[PDB]
Design a protein around this motif. Structure first.
Motif, mmCIF file in Angstrom:
data_model
loop_
_atom_site.group_PDB
_atom_site.id
_atom_site.type_symbol
_atom_site.label_atom_id
_atom_site.label_comp_id
_atom_site.label_asym_id
_atom_site.label_seq_id
_atom_site.Cartn_x
_atom_site.Cartn_y
_atom_site.Cartn_z
ATOM 1 N N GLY A 90 -87.879 -58.510 6.649
ATOM 2 C CA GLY A 90 -86.525 -58.640 7.243
ATOM 3 C C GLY A 90 -85.872 -57.206 7.632
ATOM 4 O O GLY A 90 -86.302 -56.245 7.550
ATOM 5 N N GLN A 92 -83.564 -54.318 7.197
ATOM 6 C CA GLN A 92 -83.039 -53.655 6.042
ATOM 7 C C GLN A 92 -82.094 -52.314 6.600
ATOM 8 O O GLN A 92 -82.550 -51.496 7.468
ATOM 9 C CB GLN A 92 -84.107 -52.979 5.257
ATOM 10 C CG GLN A 92 -83.808 -52.270 3.977
ATOM 11 C CD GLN A 92 -84.558 -51.994 3.019
ATOM 12 O OE1 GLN A 92 -85.609 -51.460 3.354
ATOM 13 N NE2 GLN A 92 -84.124 -52.022 1.530
ATOM 14 N N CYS B 43 -75.743 -51.841 4.728
ATOM 15 C CA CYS B 43 -75.030 -52.381 6.180
ATOM 16 C C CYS B 43 -73.582 -52.183 6.486
ATOM 17 O O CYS B 43 -73.217 -52.145 7.607
ATOM 18 C CB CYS B 43 -75.401 -53.755 6.276
ATOM 19 S SG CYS B 43 -74.166 -54.810 5.227
ATOM 20 N N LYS B 45 -71.046 -53.649 4.614
ATOM 21 C CA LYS B 45 -70.258 -54.593 4.097
ATOM 22 C C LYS B 45 -69.424 -54.410 2.950
ATOM 23 O O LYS B 45 -69.851 -53.828 1.917
ATOM 24 C CB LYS B 45 -70.941 -55.919 3.787
ATOM 25 C CG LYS B 45 -70.015 -57.087 3.620
ATOM 26 C CD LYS B 45 -71.266 -58.463 3.312
ATOM 27 C CE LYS B 45 -70.609 -59.663 2.635
ATOM 28 N NZ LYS B 45 -69.501 -60.243 3.540
ATOM 29 N N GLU B 52 -69.936 -61.829 -4.633
ATOM 30 C CA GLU B 52 -70.239 -61.349 -3.518
ATOM 31 C C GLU B 52 -71.528 -60.290 -3.448
ATOM 32 O O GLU B 52 -72.433 -60.605 -2.500
ATOM 33 C CB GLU B 52 -69.084 -60.665 -2.962
ATOM 34 C CG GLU B 52 -67.849 -61.609 -2.660
ATOM 35 C CD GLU B 52 -66.546 -60.659 -2.175
ATOM 36 O OE1 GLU B 52 -66.509 -59.304 -2.121
ATOM 37 O OE2 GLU B 52 -65.694 -61.541 -2.023
ATOM 38 N N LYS B 55 -74.549 -62.422 -4.098
ATOM 39 C CA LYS B 55 -75.031 -63.409 -2.723
ATOM 40 C C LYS B 55 -75.598 -62.367 -1.627
ATOM 41 O O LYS B 55 -76.977 -62.666 -1.239
ATOM 42 C CB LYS B 55 -73.675 -63.847 -2.231
ATOM 43 C CG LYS B 55 -73.814 -64.847 -1.037
ATOM 44 C CD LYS B 55 -72.794 -64.954 -0.178
ATOM 45 N N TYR B 56 -75.089 -61.136 -1.619
ATOM 46 C CA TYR B 56 -75.847 -60.071 -0.817
ATOM 47 C C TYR B 56 -77.191 -59.616 -1.043
ATOM 48 O O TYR B 56 -77.991 -59.775 -0.358
ATOM 49 C CB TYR B 56 -74.839 -58.929 -0.835
ATOM 50 C CG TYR B 56 -75.165 -57.829 0.003
ATOM 51 C CD1 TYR B 56 -76.132 -56.765 -0.187
ATOM 52 C CD2 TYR B 56 -74.447 -57.559 1.395
ATOM 53 C CE1 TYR B 56 -76.370 -55.827 0.765
ATOM 54 C CE2 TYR B 56 -74.589 -56.740 2.251
ATOM 55 C CZ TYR B 56 -75.917 -56.036 1.922
ATOM 56 O OH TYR B 56 -76.153 -54.661 2.760
ATOM 57 N N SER B 58 -79.051 -61.673 -2.665
ATOM 58 C CA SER B 58 -79.935 -62.759 -2.274
ATOM 59 C C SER B 58 -80.316 -62.759 -0.712
ATOM 60 O O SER B 58 -81.432 -63.322 -0.215
ATOM 61 C CB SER B 58 -79.913 -64.012 -2.932
ATOM 62 O OG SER B 58 -78.386 -64.452 -2.375
ATOM 63 N N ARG B 59 -79.385 -62.267 0.057
ATOM 64 C CA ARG B 59 -79.429 -62.510 1.293
ATOM 65 C C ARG B 59 -80.254 -61.387 2.054
ATOM 66 O O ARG B 59 -80.429 -61.264 3.408
ATOM 67 C CB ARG B 59 -78.264 -62.601 2.024
ATOM 68 C CG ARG B 59 -77.642 -63.928 1.531
ATOM 69 C CD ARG B 59 -76.247 -64.339 2.236
ATOM 70 N NE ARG B 59 -76.385 -65.287 3.490
ATOM 71 C CZ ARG B 59 -76.902 -66.231 3.806
ATOM 72 N NH1 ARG B 59 -77.305 -67.093 2.688
ATOM 73 N NH2 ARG B 59 -77.112 -66.704 5.117
ATOM 74 N N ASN B 60 -80.400 -60.148 1.526
ATOM 75 C CA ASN B 60 -80.828 -58.814 1.880
ATOM 76 C C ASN B 60 -82.059 -58.574 1.310
ATOM 77 O O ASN B 60 -82.542 -58.947 0.359
ATOM 78 C CB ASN B 60 -79.630 -57.844 1.895
ATOM 79 C CG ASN B 60 -78.647 -58.004 2.935
ATOM 80 O OD1 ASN B 60 -78.754 -57.583 3.956
ATOM 81 N ND2 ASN B 60 -77.595 -58.720 2.473
#
Lengths: 109, 109
Positions: A90, A92, B43, B45, B52, B55-56, B58-60
């Motif tokens: 993905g 990065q 990134c 964020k 949070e 979740k990050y 897991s999504r990255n």
């Protein structure tokens, strides 16, 4: 009267001693690689354009930092540089090393 | 299996080597001084709560950084500490020195 328009890197470093942060973020766009400069003021506000910083300086108590100390040039090697990389896993974001920075500065458009 | 729940400061430093940033921000509230921890992912964020960050992650795409490396404790002396000060000029945010940090850690509630 700051009449000299080209900030030196020493000048652009000065806000970083007074609680500001500067980043340059690089990623591939429509057709080429591009970089964008962000500042964070000492309160944590993220600013992406020079007029935002001018407004911030007017709305806040600032002693040592003036508009002459800012540059939104992604070619000015001050602050932390990051780049978006694609792999099969993905997209990065990685922080660049000092050694990596000069080649990126040359490469962005 | 990370069974040990108390992160060491060396562990909490580790994401800072992989493009994350950690800040602790201190200001006076209703009745006392309080501090809050923020993370910035690579990134850019901004994250203010541990869920949070979960979740990050897991999504990255993250290789070296795991949930064991995070702490939202404003008493953990890792990262950059800032404080909101009032003077007759107005409210100002300043970054604290290393020397200032331990007294603040003691003072917040």
């Amino acid at each position: 009267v700051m009449r000299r328009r080209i900030a030196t890197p020493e000048e652009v470093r000065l806000p970083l001693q007074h609680g500001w942060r500067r980043e340059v973020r690089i990623k591939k766009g429509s057709h080429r690689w591009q970089g964008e400069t962000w500042y964070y003021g000492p309160c944590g506000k993220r600013m992406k354009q020079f007029p935002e910083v001018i407004k911030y300086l007017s709305r806040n108590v600032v002693h040592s930092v003036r508009r002459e100390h800012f540059s939104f040039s992604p070619r000015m090697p001050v602050g932390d540089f990051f780049e978006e990389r694609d792999t099969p896993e993905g997209l990065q974001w990685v922080q660049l090393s000092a050694e990596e920075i000069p080649s990126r500065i040359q490469a962005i458009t």
